[PDB]
Amino acid sequence: VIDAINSGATLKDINAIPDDMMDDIYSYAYDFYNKGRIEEAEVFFRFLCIYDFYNVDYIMGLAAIYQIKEQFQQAADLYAVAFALGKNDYTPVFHTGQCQLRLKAPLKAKECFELVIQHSNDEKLKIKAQSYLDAIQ
Amino acid sequence: GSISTAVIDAINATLKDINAIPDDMMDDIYSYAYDFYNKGRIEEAEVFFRFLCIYDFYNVDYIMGLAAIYQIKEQFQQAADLYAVAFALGKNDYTPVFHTGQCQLRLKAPLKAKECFELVIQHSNDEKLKIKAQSYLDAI
Numbered sequence: 001v002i003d004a005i006n007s008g009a010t011l012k013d014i015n016a017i018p019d020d021m022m023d024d025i026y027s028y029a030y031d032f033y034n035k036g037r038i039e040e041a042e043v044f045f046r047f048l049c050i051y052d053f054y055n056v057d058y059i060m061g062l063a064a065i066y067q068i069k070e071q072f073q074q075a076a077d078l079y080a081v082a083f084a085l086g087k088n089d090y091t092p093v094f095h096t097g098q099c100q101l102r103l104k105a106p107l108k109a110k111e112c113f114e115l116v117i118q119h120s121n122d123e124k125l126k127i128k129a130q131s132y133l134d135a136i137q
Numbered sequence: 138g139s140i141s142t143a144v145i146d147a148i149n150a151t152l153k154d155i156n157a158i159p160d161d162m163m164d165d166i167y168s169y170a171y172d173f174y175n176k177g178r179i180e181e182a183e184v185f186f187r188f189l190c191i192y193d194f195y196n197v198d199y200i201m202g203l204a205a206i207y208q209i210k211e212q213f214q215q216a217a218d219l220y221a222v223a224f225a226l227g228k229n230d231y232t233p234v235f236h237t238g239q240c241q242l243r244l245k246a247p248l249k250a251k252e253c254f255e256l257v258i259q260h261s262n263d264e265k266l267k268i269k270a271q272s273y274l275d276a277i
């Protein structure tokens with residue numbers, strides 16, 4: 001672990017916890033999230049992101065908790081990283097648009113939702129993005 | 138790297154939150170980074186761009202400079218990841234997608250590269266960038 005702290009590497013890189021156990025921890029983090037146990041979900045998603053900062057779903061989980069907690073800028077920061085780590089997935093850009101509206105930045109929000117509609121292949125996501133655009137003055 | 142610093146900062150105030158370095162000094166450091174870069178001092182330029190990306194990671198100009206350095210150094214995955222951050226932050230052109238396409242071709246991912254270059258041709262209003270993208274598509 002110390003070596004990974006000094007070399008900047010992840011705990012996942014050194015197989016510090018077996019993979020099936022990490023799956024279980026992610027499932028439990030999601031259970032806490034779905035049950036509204038936000039404090040515990042936050043601990044578990046922070047734990048996961050320490051373990052593997054390059055895991056898009058771990059990042060997205062922590063970003064979602066920050067958004068629920070109305071830490072909108074912190075959520076938007078993580079969503080930008082999640083977009084870069086993902087597989088052509090514009091869901092983090094969609095949630096960034098929601099964060100920008102809550103930050104009273106509607107032109108930034110519009111740009112996010114427009115990006116989703118122009119580049120995403122996720123039809124359900126684009127429908128949602130369009131509904132936000134429909135509402136944005 | 139820069140991305141791990143961004144994530145650690147979010148997991149765990151930061152220097153940016155306290156305005157620890159004023160905008161005019163950051164502008165100067167950015168200029169100094171390109172001076173090193175332009176002279177072939179790419180290791181020093183990398184340090185300066187890493188410094189900028191520690192202070193203000195969500196700045197497209199800092200991210201694009203560092204991504205270019207990684208691409209020149211043939212750290213293609215790191216470059217691609219940073220280019221994508223610049224796009225998500227709203228970089229006002231498709232050059233991050235174009236250069237990601239180049240990175241993906243060097244990573245032996247020609248289908249990912251094709252999607253990048255097709256996105257450029259479909260959406261860029263830069264006619265010269267579109268010809269460059271089309272030339273890659275012709276070869277893939």
Ligand SMILES: NC[C@H](O)c1ccc(F)cc1
Nearest residue numbers: 088220221224234237252
């Ligand atoms: N297939 C293109 C991919 O979604 C993508 C790669 C890089 C980028 F800057 C934006 C988008």
Ligand SMILES: [Cl-]
Nearest residue numbers: 071072073074
């Ligand atoms: Cl915040």
Ligand SMILES: [Cl-]
Nearest residue numbers: 067098099102
């Ligand atoms: Cl929200």
Ligand SMILES: [Cl-]
Nearest residue numbers: 105106107108
């Ligand atoms: Cl705005």
Ligand SMILES: [Cl-]
Nearest residue numbers: 230231261263
């Ligand atoms: Cl462009």
Ligand SMILES: [Mg+2]
Nearest residue numbers: 146151153194
């Ligand atoms: Mg920050």
